[PDB]
Write a protein that binds this ligand. Structure first.
Ligand SMILES: *[C@H]1C=C(C(=O)[O-])C[C@H](O)[C@H]1O
Ligand SMILES: *[C@H]1C=C(C(=O)[O-])C[C@H](O)[C@H]1O
Lengths: 252, 252
């Protein structure tokens, strides 16, 4: 397949990269969280913009993004507004969603953005090219917080994200049973073996799906989420614990 | 299901139990290895009898068991002669193998024995009843060191083991691809939810199957093998490492 480099990282080769999500409600919050995250060990920092209360102000959004970037200038920064329909904290209009991501891209403060696939083909396609024209990489994502779609459905979604120009396709689903966890792992291998040409990230949420956060080096997920102090989705475990398990699997 | 209690250990409840195999050629290495292992942390000791070069003498076999039994009197002791067609070091006749397992049971030195399913139905059943009349538990086992059979075949072998009175049906298979590792996990979980009424032990060997050694609390395998200095089959990892991973999954 292919690899993606941001800063001094290569995504899609080696051990799965560790992503942690920073969440703060207002500026002073972001600023405290940015100082404490500096002392943890992770590959990529994701800022969960949907927990921020000042999202109608571009000024506030970029001031929070600059406090983060200052604190951690050499870590790849992933800007993610996670909409309420896919598990996030807040609902915005589609226009407001696209204006926040463009602002992020033009600012120069962010290395990647997340774009939700079901936002609408034409809107996602136009933002992907705008991003690529500024050398911002696109993580395209999809989430099912109530169920696990069949393997077939999941591979099509992932392929749909590749057709639309995502640099890194991503899917997260909620298991209703232990077999749902094996369906996610099978769709991941299937994509990675027959269709992928770039790095792919996949995960099964909650307690049953934790194995899916630990086995991406076997089944083909390029990155995984850990928690520094709080979890941004059901199932993440502490980043030091997460990192021990990855190295054990990697050096086995 | 139902569980197996041996010494103070409940097999088939909680976090998977850890088994290490002790391998020594004669009585003084058996003794040395037993002293060394006495410093590691594990639940069940497996003595692999097929590495002992003096199996022609029953008395030398029972002296080696007593030496082990003496250094570690409070751990469950599983007596396993692995035959050469199922991955082991030496060939013995069927007759001699059933005689040796009967001498182990009679000796009062072992808590459990391993019986290979494919020894033959009638012989294996009679040996099961005899062990049970002495309160000796039976791990019935089946190995494919060349490939992974279908999920269906595997479920069928495990169910036939229960049908023969095994206390703990066991299977180990060799993955030829990453899909094979998933087929092993799918068999384990289908057995655990639909047919098992007792604990089962399953593993996918080698470096590709390592994940199967760590995810037994999710997919339904009650025990897993680790290595104290050397591995007793392809893919086992260091018991302290193995145990760190089981803990994180346990408290995930
Ligand atoms: C989607 C990834 C999530 C998780 O691992 O399940 C939460 C994260 O913050 C989202 O970006
Ligand atoms: C059968 C279990 C094998 C496994 O660990 O892969 C090895 C072991 O010693 C045999 O007992």
């Amino acid at each position: 397949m292919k690899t993606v480099t941001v800063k001094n990282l290569i995504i899609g080769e080696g051990m799965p990269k560790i992503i942690v999500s920073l969440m703060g409600r207002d500026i002073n919050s972001v600023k405290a969280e940015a100082l404490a995250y500096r002392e943890a060990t992770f590959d990529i920092l994701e800022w969960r913009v949907d927990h921020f209360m000042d999202i109608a102000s571009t000024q506030s959004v970029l001031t929070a993004a600059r406090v983060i970037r200052d604190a951690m200038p050499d870590i790849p920064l992933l800007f993610t507004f996670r909409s309420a329909k896919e598990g996030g904290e807040q609902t915005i209009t589609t226009q407001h969603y696209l204006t926040l991501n463009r602002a992020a891209i033009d600012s120069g403060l962010v290395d990647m953005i997340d774009l939700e696939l079901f936002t609408g083909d034409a809107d996602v396609k136009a933002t992907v090219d705008y991003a690529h024209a500024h050398n911002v990489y696109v993580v395209m994502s999809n989430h099912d917080f109530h169920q696990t779609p069949s393997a077939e459905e999941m591979v099509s979604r992932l392929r749909k994200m590749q057709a639309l120009g995502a640099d890194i396709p991503k899917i997260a689903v909620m298991p209703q049973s232990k077999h749902d966890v094996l369906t996610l792992l099978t769709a991941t291998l299937e994509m990675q073996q027959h269709y992928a040409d770039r790095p792919v990230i996949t995960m099964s949420m909650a307690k049953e799906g934790v194995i899916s956060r630990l086995a991406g080096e076997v089944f083909g997920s390029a990155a995984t989420f850990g928690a520094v102090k709080q979890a941004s989705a059901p199932g993440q475990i502490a980043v030091n614990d997460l990192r021990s398990v990855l190295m054990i699997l990697h050096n086995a």
